[PDB]
Each structure stands twice: as structure tokens, then as C-alpha cells.
Coordinates of C-alpha atoms in Angstrom, one line a residue:
Chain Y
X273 CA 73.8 -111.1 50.4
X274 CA 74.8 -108.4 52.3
X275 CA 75.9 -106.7 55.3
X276 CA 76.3 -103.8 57.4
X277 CA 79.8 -103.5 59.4
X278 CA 81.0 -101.4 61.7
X279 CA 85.1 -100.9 63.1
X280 CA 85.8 -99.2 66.5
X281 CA 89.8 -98.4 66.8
X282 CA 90.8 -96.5 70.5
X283 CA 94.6 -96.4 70.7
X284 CA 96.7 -94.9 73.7
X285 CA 99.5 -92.9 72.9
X286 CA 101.0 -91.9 76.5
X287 CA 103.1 -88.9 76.5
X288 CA 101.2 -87.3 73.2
X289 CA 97.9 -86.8 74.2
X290 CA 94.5 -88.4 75.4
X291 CA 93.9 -92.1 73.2
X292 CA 92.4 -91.3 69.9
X293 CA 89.5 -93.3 68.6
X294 CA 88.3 -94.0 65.1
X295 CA 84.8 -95.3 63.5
X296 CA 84.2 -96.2 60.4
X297 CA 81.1 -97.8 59.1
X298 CA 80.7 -99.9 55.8
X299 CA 77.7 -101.7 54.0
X300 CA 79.5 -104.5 51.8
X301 CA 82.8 -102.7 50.6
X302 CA 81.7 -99.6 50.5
X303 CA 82.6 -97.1 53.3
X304 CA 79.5 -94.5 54.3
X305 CA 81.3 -93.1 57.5
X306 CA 84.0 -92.5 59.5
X307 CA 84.6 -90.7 62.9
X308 CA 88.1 -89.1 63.8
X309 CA 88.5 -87.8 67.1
X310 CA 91.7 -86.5 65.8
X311 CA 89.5 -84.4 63.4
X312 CA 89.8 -80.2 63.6
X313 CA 85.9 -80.5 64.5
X314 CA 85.1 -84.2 64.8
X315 CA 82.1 -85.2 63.3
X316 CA 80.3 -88.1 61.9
X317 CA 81.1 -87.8 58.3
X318 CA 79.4 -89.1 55.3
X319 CA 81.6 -91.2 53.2
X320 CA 79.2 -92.4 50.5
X321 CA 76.6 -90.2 48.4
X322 CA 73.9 -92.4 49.2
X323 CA 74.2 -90.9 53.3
X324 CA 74.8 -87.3 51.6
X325 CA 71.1 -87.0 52.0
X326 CA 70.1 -88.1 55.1
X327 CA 69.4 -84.3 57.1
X328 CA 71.1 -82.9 59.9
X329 CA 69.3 -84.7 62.8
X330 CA 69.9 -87.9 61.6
X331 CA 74.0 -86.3 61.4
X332 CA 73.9 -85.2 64.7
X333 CA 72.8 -88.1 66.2
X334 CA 75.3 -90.1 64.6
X335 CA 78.0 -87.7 65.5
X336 CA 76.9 -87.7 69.4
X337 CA 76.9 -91.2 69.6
X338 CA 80.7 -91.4 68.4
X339 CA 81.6 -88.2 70.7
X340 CA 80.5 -89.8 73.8
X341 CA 81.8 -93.7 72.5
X342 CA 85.3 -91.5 72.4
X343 CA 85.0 -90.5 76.1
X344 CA 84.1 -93.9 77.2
X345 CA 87.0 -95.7 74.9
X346 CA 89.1 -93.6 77.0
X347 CA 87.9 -94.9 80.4
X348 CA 87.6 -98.2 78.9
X349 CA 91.3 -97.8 78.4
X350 CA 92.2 -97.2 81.7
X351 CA 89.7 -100.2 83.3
X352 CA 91.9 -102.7 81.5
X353 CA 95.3 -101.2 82.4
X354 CA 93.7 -101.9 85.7
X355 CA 92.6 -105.2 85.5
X356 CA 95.8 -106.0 84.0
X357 CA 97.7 -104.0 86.5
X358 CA 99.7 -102.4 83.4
X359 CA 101.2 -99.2 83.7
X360 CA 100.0 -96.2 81.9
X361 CA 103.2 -95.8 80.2
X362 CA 102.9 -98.5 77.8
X363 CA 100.4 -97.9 74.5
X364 CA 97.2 -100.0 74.2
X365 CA 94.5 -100.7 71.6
X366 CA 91.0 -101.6 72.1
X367 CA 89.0 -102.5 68.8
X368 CA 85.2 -103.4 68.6
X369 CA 83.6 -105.1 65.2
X370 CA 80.1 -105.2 65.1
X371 CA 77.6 -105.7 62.5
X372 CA 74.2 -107.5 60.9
X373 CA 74.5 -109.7 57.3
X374 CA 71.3 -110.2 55.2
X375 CA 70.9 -113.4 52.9
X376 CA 69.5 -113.0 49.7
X377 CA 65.8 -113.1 51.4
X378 CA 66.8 -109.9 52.8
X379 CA 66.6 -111.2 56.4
X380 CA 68.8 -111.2 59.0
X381 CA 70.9 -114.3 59.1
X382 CA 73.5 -113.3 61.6
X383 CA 74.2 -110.3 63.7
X384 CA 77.8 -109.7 65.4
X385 CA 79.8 -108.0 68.2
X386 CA 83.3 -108.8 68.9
X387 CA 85.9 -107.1 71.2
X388 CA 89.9 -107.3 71.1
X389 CA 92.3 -105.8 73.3
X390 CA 96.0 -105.4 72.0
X391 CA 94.8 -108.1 69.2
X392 CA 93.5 -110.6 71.3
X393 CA 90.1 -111.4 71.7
X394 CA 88.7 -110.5 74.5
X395 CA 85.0 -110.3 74.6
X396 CA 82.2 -111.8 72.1
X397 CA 78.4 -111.3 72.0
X398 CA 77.6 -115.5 71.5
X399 CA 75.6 -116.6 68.3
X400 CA 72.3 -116.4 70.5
X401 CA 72.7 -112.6 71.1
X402 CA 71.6 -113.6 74.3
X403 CA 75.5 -114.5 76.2
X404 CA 78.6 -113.1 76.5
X405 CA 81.9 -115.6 76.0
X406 CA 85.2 -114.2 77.7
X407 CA 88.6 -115.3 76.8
X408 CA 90.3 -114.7 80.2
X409 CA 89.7 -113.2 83.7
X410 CA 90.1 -109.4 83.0
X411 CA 87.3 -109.7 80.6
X412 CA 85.1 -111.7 83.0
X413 CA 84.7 -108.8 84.9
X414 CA 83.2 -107.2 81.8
X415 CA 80.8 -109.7 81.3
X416 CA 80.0 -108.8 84.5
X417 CA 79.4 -105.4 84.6
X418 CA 77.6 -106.1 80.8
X419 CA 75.2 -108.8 82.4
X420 CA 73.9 -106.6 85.2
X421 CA 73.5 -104.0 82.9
X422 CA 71.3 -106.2 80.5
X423 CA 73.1 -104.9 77.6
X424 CA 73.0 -108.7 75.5
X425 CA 69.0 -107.5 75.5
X426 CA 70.1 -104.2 73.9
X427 CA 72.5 -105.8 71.3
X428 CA 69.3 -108.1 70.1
X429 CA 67.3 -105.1 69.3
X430 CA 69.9 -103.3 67.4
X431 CA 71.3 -105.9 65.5
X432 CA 67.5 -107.8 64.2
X433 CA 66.0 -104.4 64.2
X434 CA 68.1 -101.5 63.6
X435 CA 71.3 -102.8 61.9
X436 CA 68.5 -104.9 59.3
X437 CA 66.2 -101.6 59.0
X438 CA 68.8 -99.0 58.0
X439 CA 70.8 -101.5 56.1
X440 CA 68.0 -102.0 53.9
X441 CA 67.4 -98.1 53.7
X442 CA 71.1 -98.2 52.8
X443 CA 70.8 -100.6 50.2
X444 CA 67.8 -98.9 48.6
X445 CA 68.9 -95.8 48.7
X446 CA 72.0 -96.7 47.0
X447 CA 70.9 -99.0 44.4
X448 CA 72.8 -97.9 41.6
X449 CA 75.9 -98.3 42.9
X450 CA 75.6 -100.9 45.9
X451 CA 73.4 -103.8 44.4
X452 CA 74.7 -103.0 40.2
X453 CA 78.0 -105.1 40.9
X454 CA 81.1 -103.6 38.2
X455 CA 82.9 -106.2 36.4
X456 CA 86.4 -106.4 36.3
X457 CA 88.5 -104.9 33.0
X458 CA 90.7 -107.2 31.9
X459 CA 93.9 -108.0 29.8
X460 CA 96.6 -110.4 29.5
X461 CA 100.4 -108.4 29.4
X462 CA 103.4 -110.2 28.2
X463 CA 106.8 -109.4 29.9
X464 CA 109.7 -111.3 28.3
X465 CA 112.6 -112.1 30.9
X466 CA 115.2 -113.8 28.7
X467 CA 115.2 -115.2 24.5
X468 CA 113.2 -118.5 26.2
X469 CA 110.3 -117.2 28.7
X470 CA 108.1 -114.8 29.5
X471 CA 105.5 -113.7 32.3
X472 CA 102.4 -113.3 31.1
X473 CA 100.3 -111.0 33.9
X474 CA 96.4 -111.6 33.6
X475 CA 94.6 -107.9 35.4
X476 CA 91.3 -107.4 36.9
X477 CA 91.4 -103.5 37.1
X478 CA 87.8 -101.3 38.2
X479 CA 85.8 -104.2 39.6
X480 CA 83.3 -104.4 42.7
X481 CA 82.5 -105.9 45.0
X482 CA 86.3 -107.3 45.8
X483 CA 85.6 -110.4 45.8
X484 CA 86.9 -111.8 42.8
X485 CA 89.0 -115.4 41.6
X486 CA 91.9 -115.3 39.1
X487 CA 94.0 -117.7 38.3
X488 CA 95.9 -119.6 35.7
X489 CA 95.5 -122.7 33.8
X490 CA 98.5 -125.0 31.9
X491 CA 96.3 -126.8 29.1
X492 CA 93.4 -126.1 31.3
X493 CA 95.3 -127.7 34.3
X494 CA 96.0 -125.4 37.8
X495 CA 99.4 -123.6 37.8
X496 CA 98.6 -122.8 41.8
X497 CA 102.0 -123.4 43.1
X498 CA 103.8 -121.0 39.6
X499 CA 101.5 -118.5 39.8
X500 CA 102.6 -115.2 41.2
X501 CA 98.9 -113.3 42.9
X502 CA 98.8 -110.1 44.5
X503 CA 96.7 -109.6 46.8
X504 CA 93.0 -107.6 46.1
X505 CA 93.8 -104.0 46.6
X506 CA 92.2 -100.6 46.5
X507 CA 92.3 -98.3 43.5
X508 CA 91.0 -95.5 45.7
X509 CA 87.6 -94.8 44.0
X510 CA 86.2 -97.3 44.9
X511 CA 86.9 -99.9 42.7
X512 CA 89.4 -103.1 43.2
X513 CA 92.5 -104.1 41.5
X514 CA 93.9 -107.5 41.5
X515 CA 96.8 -109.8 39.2
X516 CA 98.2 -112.9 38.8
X517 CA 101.2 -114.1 37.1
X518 CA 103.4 -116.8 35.5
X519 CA 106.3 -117.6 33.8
X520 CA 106.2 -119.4 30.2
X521 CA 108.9 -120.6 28.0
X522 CA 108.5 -118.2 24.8
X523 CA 106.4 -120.3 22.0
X524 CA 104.1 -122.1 24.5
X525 CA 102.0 -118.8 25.1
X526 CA 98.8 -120.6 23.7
X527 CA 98.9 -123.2 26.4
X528 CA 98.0 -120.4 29.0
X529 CA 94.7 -119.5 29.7
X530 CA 93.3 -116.9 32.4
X531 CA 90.3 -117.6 35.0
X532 CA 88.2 -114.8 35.9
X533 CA 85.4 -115.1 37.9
X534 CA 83.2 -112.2 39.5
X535 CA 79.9 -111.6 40.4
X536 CA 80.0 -108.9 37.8
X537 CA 80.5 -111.2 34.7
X538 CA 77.3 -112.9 33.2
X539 CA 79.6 -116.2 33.3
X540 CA 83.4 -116.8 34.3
X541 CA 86.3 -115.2 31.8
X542 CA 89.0 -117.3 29.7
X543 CA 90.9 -115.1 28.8
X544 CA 94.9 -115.4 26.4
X545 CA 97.6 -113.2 25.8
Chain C
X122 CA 73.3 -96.4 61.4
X123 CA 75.2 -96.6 64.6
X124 CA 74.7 -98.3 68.1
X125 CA 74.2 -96.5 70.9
X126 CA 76.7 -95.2 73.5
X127 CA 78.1 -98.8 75.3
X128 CA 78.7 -99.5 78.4
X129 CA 82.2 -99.0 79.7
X130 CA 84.7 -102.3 79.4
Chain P
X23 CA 102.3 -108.3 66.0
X24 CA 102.2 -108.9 62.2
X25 CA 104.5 -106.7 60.3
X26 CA 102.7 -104.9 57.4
X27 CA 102.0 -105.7 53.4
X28 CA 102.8 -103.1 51.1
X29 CA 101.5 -102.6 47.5
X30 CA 102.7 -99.2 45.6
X31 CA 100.7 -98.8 42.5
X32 CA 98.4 -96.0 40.2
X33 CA 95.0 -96.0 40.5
X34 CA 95.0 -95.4 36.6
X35 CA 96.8 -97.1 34.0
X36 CA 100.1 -94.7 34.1
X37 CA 100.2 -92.1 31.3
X38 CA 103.5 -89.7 31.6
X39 CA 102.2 -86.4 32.0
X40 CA 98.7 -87.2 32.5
X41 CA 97.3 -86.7 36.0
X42 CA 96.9 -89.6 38.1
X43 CA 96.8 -91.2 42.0
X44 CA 100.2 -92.8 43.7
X45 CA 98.7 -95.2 45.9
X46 CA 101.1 -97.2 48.9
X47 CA 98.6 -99.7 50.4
X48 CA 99.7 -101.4 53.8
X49 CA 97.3 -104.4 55.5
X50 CA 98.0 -106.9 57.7
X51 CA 99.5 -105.1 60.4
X52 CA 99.4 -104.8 63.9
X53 CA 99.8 -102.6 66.6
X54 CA 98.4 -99.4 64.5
X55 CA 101.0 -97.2 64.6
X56 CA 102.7 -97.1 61.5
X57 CA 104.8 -94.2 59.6
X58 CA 103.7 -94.2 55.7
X59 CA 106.0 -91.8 53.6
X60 CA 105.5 -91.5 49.6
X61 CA 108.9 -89.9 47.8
X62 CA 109.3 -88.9 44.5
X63 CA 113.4 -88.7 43.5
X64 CA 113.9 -90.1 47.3
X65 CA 112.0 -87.0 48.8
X66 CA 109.1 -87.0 51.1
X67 CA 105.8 -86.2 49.1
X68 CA 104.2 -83.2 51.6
X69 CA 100.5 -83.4 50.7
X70 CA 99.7 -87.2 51.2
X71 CA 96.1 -88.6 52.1
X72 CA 95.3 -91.7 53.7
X73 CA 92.2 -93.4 54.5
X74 CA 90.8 -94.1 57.4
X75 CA 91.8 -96.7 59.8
X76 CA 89.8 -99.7 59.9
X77 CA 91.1 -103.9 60.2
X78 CA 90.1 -107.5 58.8
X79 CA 88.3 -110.3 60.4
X80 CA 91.6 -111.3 62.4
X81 CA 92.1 -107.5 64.2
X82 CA 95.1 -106.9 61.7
X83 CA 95.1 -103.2 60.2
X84 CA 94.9 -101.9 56.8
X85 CA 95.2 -98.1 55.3
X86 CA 95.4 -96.8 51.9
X87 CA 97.8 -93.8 51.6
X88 CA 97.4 -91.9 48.4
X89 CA 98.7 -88.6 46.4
X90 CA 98.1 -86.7 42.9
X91 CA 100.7 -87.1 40.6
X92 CA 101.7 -86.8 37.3
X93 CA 103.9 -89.4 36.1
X94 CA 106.9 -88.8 33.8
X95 CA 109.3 -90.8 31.9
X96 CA 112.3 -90.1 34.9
X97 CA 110.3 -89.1 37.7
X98 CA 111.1 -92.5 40.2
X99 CA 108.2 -92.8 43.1
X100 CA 108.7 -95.2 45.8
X101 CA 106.8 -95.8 49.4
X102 CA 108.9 -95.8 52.7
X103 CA 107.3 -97.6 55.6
X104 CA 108.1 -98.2 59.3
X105 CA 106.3 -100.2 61.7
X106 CA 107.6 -101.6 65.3
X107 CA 107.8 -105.0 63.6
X108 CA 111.0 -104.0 61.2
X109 CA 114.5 -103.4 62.0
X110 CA 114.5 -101.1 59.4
X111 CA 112.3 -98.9 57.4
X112 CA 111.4 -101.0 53.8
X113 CA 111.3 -99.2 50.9
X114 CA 109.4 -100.4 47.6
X115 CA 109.4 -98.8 44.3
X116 CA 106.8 -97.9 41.9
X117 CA 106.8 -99.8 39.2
X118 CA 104.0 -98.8 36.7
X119 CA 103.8 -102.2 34.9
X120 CA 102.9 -103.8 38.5

């Protein structure tokens, strides 16, 4: 499967300036854009080489649409203060995820909207894309103003026509890289602590999509609770990094085994020092 | 590919 | 609010005196605002990157702040990070093995 996501970030900053809003866009783990209206010239901006190409009309569009979502973050800012009755001197954050995900038919099987206001939701598009649900009074009034202006109608259309059409332009276009998943690297490092144990680290290094399960066995037993795992990070091209960890007595390395399972691997890893 | 300008909240 | 997770790491297998990327990774966090400082011998790095801002299913923040650098043998690297949610600024150190 896969899936198109977007990420809407307006913060206020009182005292330094108007609230600045970010956008960025990803299908699966991959980024492909991000707005900045912090930016010298802000612009929609590809992040991805497979957006590279589209041409400057479809770059302009794009960037419009996230100069005049800005402006209206803004006011949006300032309705909820009011609704609230907060005071402008206090900073707020509005964020906005939406999105479509495709099953391995290539079909739409969900599409999403979801609001939050200083972390809390606030406002959802229901499962029907039909129906707003609102978690308190401030954002009934939303719903409101959303309902008379029929937008649930306009959500529908994006997210089964749109959101599915350009995700599978997307994914087409960027084959090579966004449906060839890249197995994790991997090797087992030995640390000795004292004369009578030793950590032995298992790494996943260059691996995508992040997804990914690692863990270690004790004569092919769990070790859940004595296993030290950090948690799935960037390595900033791209790629994912992940360990896990333990701590053997020295002699009993051969007990140990390492679990790796990722979409890139023919068949899960069992790995030993 | 983005949606359209939103309503204000 | 939920304070922030921080990761310090190389985005290549460390190689003194071969060109590489000093990553500090913070997720988890919330409100935004956040103050992300990479040093090298307890000195702010100038020319550090970061990604853009973008959060997980549960609204919490995450940003990847990154440099060039060449690692050496005595060269120590360490992120700095303050967030509203700590009563001081925490401090982790690279450690190339981790």
C-alpha cells in the first residue's frame, strides 16, 4: 500500500512577526514538498526528483495555493483566539493532516482530514467524507461555517479523485525509487563492558521504507524486556537507521540471535555476532 | 498535489 | 506538552578525516518551538540545516538538524537542545559507536 500525506503547521509568535506557516507533502516516507513562509521568496519547492519535472504551471499552482492557505492560517488564528476569548499575547498552533492511502489494488481505501489546535483535536472530516465531528464548542462553530459552505462535498472530490490520481502519477513517476523498497545493511557489534559481559548491538543502517522489526532472541526465546531499541531515525538521504541491544555474559555469545524483518528482504534475517 | 485554498476555521 | 527525543548520530559509518553528516534528531515534541544547537569542542556549529517541520499521527513534532563534518580522533561533537518542557537545556554527546 500506499499513501499520499500532507502536514499543515501555522504557529503564532506575538511580538516577532505575523504566524508563520509550513507545508510539507509526502508519498509514503518520502518528502516531495515543502512550503516556508519564512522562506526569502516562498515558494512551493520540490523535495523529490520525481516532482523535478513537473513544469512551471503545475509549480505555480502549487505555490499559490500555499500563499493564500498562509493568509488564511493567519485569520484562522485570530478566529480561535476569539472563540476562546484568548489574548493575542499568548503563542498558538494550528496543524491540519490530510491525506488519501491506496491498498495494494491501487484504490482508494481511506481518505483523511484532521485538525488540532494547540495539540488537541479539534476538527475531523468523519470516515463517510460526508460529516464533520467536533471535539468542543469553539470548533462547532467551524463546523458551522464548513457545513454552509459545503466544503465535506469538496473534501470527497479531492481525496477519491485528486489525492488517488496524482498519487498514482507520483508513484509511477518515481518507480525506481518509491515502489523498489532498500533493504537494511546489517551487522552484529560486540562491546565488552567488564571480563564477564558484553553488549552485542544488532544495526539496520540504509533501509526504506522505515518500517522495519528488530529484535533479539535468547535460544530463540524474546529478550523484549533486556533489549535496549532506538527508536527508527533519519540518516538524512533518505534512508533509515535503527538498533537494538543487549547485554550477554562473555562465552554465551552463540545463544544470541538477531531478528530482522523488512519489506526489503526476500525473507526475515537471523543474524550472530 | 495539494488541496485547494480552505475555508477559514 | 511532550518534551522532545534526541538522537545525535552520522549519517555514515564515522571515518576520522573522511567527510561525513552530524545529524541531532528531535521527535515527539510539542509546542514547536524548540532551540537545536550542534557544537563541536562545546562551540555552536554556525552553518547547521534542518529539515522541515512536519509531526506524527498524535500532533507531536519532529525535525532533523544536520551539518558536514569531518570527524577526527579528538574532535568531541555533542547536540544542545531547549524546549519549554525542560528546566534546563540537555546536552547529548556524539558517540560514533551509537
Amino acid at each position: 500500500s500506499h499513501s499520499m500525506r500532507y502536514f499543515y503547521t501555522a504557529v503564532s509568535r506575538p511580538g516577532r512577526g505575523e504566524p508563520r506557516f509550513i507545508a510539507v507533502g509526502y508519498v509514503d516516507d518520502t518528502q516531495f514538498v515543502r512550503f516556508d513562509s519564512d522562506a526569502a521568496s516562498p515558494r512551493g519547492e520540490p523535495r523529490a526528483p520525481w516532482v523535478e519535472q513537473e513544469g512551471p504551471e503545475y509549480w505555480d499552482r502549487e505555490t499559490q495555493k500555499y500563499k493564500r492557505q498562509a493568509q488564511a492560517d493567519r485569520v484562522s488564528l485570530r478566529n480561535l483566539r476569539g472563540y476562546y476569548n484568548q489574548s493575542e499575547a499568548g503563542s498558538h498552533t494550528l496543524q491540519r493532516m490530510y491525506g488519501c492511502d491506496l491498498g495494494p489494488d491501487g484504490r482508494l481505501l481511506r481518505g483523511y482530514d484532521q485538525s488540532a489546535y494547540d495539540g488537541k483535536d479539534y476538527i475531523a472530516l468523519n470516515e463517510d467524507l460526508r460529516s464533520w465531528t467536533a471535539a468542543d464548542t469553539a470548533a462547532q462553530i467551524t463546523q458551522r461555517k464548513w457545513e454552509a459552505a459545503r466544503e465535506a462535498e469538496q473534501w470527497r472530490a479531492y481525496l477519491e479523485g485528486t489525492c488517488v490520481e496524482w498519487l498514482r502519477r507520483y508513484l509511477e513517476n518515481g518507480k525506481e525509487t518509491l515502489q523498489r523498497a532498500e533493504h537494511p545493511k546489517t551487522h552484529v557489534t560486540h562491546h565488552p563492558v567488564s571480563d564477564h559481559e558484553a553488549t552485542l548491538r544488532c544495526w539496520a543502517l540504509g533501509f526504506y521504507p522505515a518500517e522495519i522489526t528488530l529484535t533479539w532472541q535468547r535460544d530463540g526465546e524474546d529478550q523484549t524486556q533486556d533489549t535496549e531499541l532506538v527508536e527508527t531515525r533519519p540518516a538524512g538521504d533518505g534512508t533509515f537507521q535503527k538498533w537494538a541491544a543487549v547485554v550477554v555474559p562473555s562465552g554465551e555469545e552463540q545463544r544470541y540471535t538477531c531478528h530482522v524483518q523488512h519489506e526489503g528482504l526476500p525473507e526475515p534475517l537471523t543474524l550472530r555476532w | 498535489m495539494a488541496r485547494e485554498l480552505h475555508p477559514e476555521y | 506538552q511532550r518534551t522532545p527525543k534526541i538522537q545525535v548520530y552520522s549519517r555514515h559509518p564515522a571515518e576520522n578525516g573522511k567527510s561525513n553528516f552530524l545529524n541531532c534528531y528531535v521527535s515527539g515534541f510539542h509546542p514547536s518551538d524548540i532551540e537545536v544547537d550542534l557544537l563541536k569542542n562545546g562551540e555552536r556549529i554556525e552553518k547547521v540545516e534542518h529539515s522541515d517541520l512536519s509531526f506524527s499521527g498524535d500532533w507531536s513534532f519532529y525535525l532533523l538538524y544536520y551539518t558536514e563534518f569531518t570527524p577526527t580522533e579528538k574532535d568531541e561533537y555533542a547536540c544542545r537542545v531547549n524546549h519549554v518542557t525542560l528546566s534546563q537545556p540537555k546536552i547529548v554527546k556524539w558517540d560514533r559507536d551509537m
